[PDB]
Amino acid sequence: KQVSWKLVTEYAMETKCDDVLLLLGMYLEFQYSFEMCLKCIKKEQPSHYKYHEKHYANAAIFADSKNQKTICQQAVDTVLAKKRVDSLQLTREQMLTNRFNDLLDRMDIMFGSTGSADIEEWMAGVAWLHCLLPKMDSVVYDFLKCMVYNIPKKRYWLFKGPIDSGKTTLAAALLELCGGKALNVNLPLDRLNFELGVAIDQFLVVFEDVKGTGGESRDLPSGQGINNLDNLRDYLDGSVKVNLEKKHLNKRTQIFPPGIVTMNEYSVPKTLQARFVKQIDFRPKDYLKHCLERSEFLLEKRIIQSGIALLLMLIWYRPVAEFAQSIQSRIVEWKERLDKEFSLSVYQKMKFNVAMGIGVLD
């Protein structure tokens, strides 16, 4: 009779779906009676089995509409219209809490009744990560406060180290823990601005492997990335706003996002150095490598690079009140979960096993 465009927009806003084709393809699965849906019975996809029921009726009418895409276009624009509002209205801590909430939804399913994730292998990831840097759980908390506070000339951390030292991994988990885009400044001074535009609306940015000049004697390729950063002081310390680009034309004007610079031991100009409020030197450690050699699951399952392993470390080490009021109920809920499955002496042993480089789970 008359397809309800509203319900479709609701489903989209509930699934957080900003892809028109992906929305179309999912709403259409609902057109079949749920009174038999195996996707639901078998709980295949949460984005499906939690809405099929409610939307059967409307999806059945939807499958007969003459402009299903136009409808999905408005549902999507709605998700984007909201993503644009929060962009200007939400505070940074709220930005961070939403990210956090989205990661918990991911964790709720991973370690749930209908999920594959093995939490024991993920706490092993926490043990390995907490052995990568001293007072690692305090570091992540600090980093998070640095990013949310986002204060001029104190918004960037510099990860320096050889390859396979750990900065890339920690810098990756940190990225996913907060949401944000990595960028590449090892480009020609004219190709730069396009890349810099990527950081639009982002919470944080990670300048992956910035290459410098000097050090070719130590087998390190000369690049202009370091040189470009020293020319992007305005961006890094962000005291005033900046104009960002995309679509071959100027878009947003804002405070460049705070972040991390991953580097490979190139000499740094004193003017560049001064832009980093914190520096972390990573050196490859033998036991850590050996631990992995005897714990393939941490790599093959991409656990130690996952921002989830870091959120997990927080929930496990950090005091509840350190989180936002709004999300604390969900945090205590996970602490109890965790505390109920792992004792301290068990988690501690995992850390001991890493130190001995033998296999977290031995």
CB-based contacts of 334, cutoff 8 Å, min separation 6: 104, 107, 315
User: What residues between 147 and 166 interact with a second copy by CB under 8 A?
Assistant: 151-154
Interaction partner, residue 7 (a second copy, Zn ion, none; CB < 5-8 Å by kind): none
Report whether 359 belongs to an annotated binding site: no
Distance CA 288, CA 355 (A): 7
Least distance CB 53 / Zn ion (angstroms):
8
Least distance CB 223 / a second copy (angstroms):
11
Report whether 290 belongs to an annotated binding site: no
Q: Which of 250, 267, 329, 343 binds a second copy (CB under 8 A)?
A: 250
User: What residues between 203 and 232 interact with a second copy by CB under 8 A?
Assistant: none
Least distance CB 52 / Zn ion (angstroms):
3
Least distance CB 321 / a second copy (angstroms):
21
Nearer to Zn ion, 90 or 320 (CB): 90
Report whether 248 belongs to an annotated binding site: no
Report whether 52 belongs to an annotated binding site: yes
**CA nearest to 197, candidates 242, 259, 233:** 242
Q: How many CB atoms lie within 10 A of CB 354?
A: 27
Interaction partner, residue 198 (Zn ion, a second copy, none; CB < 5-8 Å by kind): a second copy
Does residue 120 contact residue 200 with C-beta atoms inside 8 Å?
no
Write the DSSP string, 24-91.
HHHHGGGGS-TTT-HHHHTT--HHHHTTHHHHHHHHHHHTT-S-HHHHHHHHHHHHHHHHHHHHHHS-
Report whether 349 belongs to an annotated binding site: no
Does residue 129 contact residue 347 with C-beta atoms inside 8 Å?
no
Token pair for residue 13? 């806003």
Strand 242-246 and strand 249-254: pairing? antiparallel
Report whether 166 belongs to an annotated binding site: yes
Instruction: Give, as one character, the DSSP assignment of residue 34.
Output: T
Instruction: Give, as one character, the DSSP assignment of residue 269.
Output: -
Interaction partner, residue 142 (a second copy, Zn ion, none; CB < 5-8 Å by kind): none
Does residue 171 contact residue 139 with C-beta atoms inside 8 Å?
no
Q: Which stretch binds a second copy (CB under 8 A): 26-34, 322-330, 337-345, 354-362?
A: 26-34
Least distance CB 44 / Zn ion (angstroms):
8
Distance CA 165, CA 31 (A): 52
Distance CA 124, CA 227 (A): 40
Nearer to Zn ion, 34 or 128 (CB): 34
Q: Which of 18, 43, 54, 68 binds a second copy (CB under 8 A)?
A: 68
Report whether 146 belongs to an annotated binding site: no
Instruction: Give, as one character, the DSSP assignment of residue 301.
Output: T
Laid out side by side, the sheet with 180-183 consists of 180-183, 204-210, 259-263, 156-160, 278-281
User: What residues between 15 and 54 interact with Zn ion by CB under 5 A?
Assistant: 34, 37, 39-40, 52
Interaction partner, residue 240 (a second copy, Zn ion, none; CB < 5-8 Å by kind): a second copy
Task: Strands of 119-168 (E only): list them.
Answer: 156-160
> Which residues would be at the binding site for a second copy (CB under 8 A)?
5-6, 19, 21-22, 24-26, 28-29, 44-45, 63-64, 66-69, 73-74, 77-78, 80-85, 88-89, 151-154, 172, 190-191, 198, 239-240, 247-250, 299-300, 302, 305
> Which residues would be at the binding site for Zn ion (CB under 5 A)?
34, 37, 39-40, 52
Residue ranges for the binding site? Answer: 37, 40, 48, 52, 161-168
